[PDB]
């Protein structure tokens, strides 16, 4: 019945003014990539930074089980593209946002699927 809710804790810590998790591993890249959210190699475009995935995963970084019956990680072993405006808090960004299952872009930060 009891389960630690690390996601909620981080969200509330941030809203209270806590400093975001640091030392996410930022990659050098061309910044001419596809802009998709989570890729097997860095794919930042001009308005993103690319980061090693494990270092941007709340569960990896906090040393806690992944919220998934299999315990699989969406980010470990991949690269995550974060908008440059949100790159001060990659863990918060990946926690709060969702990837479009159709185009692989971040909902609201690249996904245009809901356009006319």
């Amino acid at each position: 019945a009891f389960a630690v809710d690390a996601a909620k804790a981080y969200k509330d810590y941030l809203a209270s003014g806590g400093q975001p998790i640091t030392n996410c591993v930022k990659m050098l890249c061309t910044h001419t990539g596809t802009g998709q959210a989570i890729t097997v190699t860095p794919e930042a475009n001009m308005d993103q930074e690319s980061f090693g995935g494990a270092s941007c995963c709340l569960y990896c970084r906090c040393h806690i089980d992944h919220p998934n019956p299999k315990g699989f990680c969406d980010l470990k072993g991949k690269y995550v593209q974060i908008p440059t405006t949100c790159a001060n808090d990659p863990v918060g960004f990946t926690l709060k946002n969702t990837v479009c299952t159709v185009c692989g872009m971040w909902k609201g930060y690249g996904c245009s699927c809901d356009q006319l």
């Binding site: 996410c24 591993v25 050098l28 890249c29 860095p42 090693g52 995963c57 040393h63």
Partner: protein, 301 residues
Amino acid sequence: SSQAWQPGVAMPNLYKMQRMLLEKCDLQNYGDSATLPKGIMMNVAKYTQLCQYLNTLTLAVPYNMRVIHFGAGSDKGVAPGTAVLRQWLPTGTLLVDSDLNDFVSDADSTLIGDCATVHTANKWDLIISDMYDPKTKNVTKENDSKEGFFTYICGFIQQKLALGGSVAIKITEHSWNADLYKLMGHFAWWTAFVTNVNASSSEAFLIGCNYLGKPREQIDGYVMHANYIFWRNTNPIQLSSYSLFDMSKFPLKLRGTAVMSLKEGQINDMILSLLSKGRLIIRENNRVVISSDVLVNNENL
């Protein structure tokens, strides 16, 4: 310069041929720092320049490549070097990393413990080591060849590096081992590579390019380390981050290098020539299985 636009500087061949005596390392630029791109860590920059240099050599790059990375943990609890290696290596490359202390990594598997506890059933195509103990930086004591993890690395290369494979092993003025230099003579080529971002340090990567499993040249490692320090002492390297801004040709080309299993009796001169050119890897192509030895103790009463 010319040099400032490279990823770093490799020991020139003439310095390898000297017979110098070991001196203290006194670097002119000791305290200069490169200007890293915004938000980029030294370890990302260093590994990026190492990989840029390795792109210029004749590394074998087979399908289902196997790479192992020792000393991969940072005091931050993450693995920036592993992240760069995985970016550089072809997608799908099997990457294992290891460190004494716990860390989170993008590697396919990670072993925590002293490197001497690491065992692998399989052979590897590339071995990277950043292992280092900053206690060795004591200028008040004589600078002798070090054992510790270097003894492990030497045995690991001789036992588990595929013929044709390569290594890059981090050394410094005080963190070095004579047998490891001697083992560089068992490759088709070798050098000591200094990254331009960390050129203010006596750090280098000792790179062995295309392993032959036998001495091609006889190297005295005490002398060769003295030669390396002489080179560093007399050739100031300008700190530079210039190469970090051009990543268009960064990925390692998937060459599809051939892998064969062969018995010692079949390694003729034509095979040795293919190995020496980066055109062949010799090892089993079985599943990759690793383990860490764990010491068990019960401390109760």
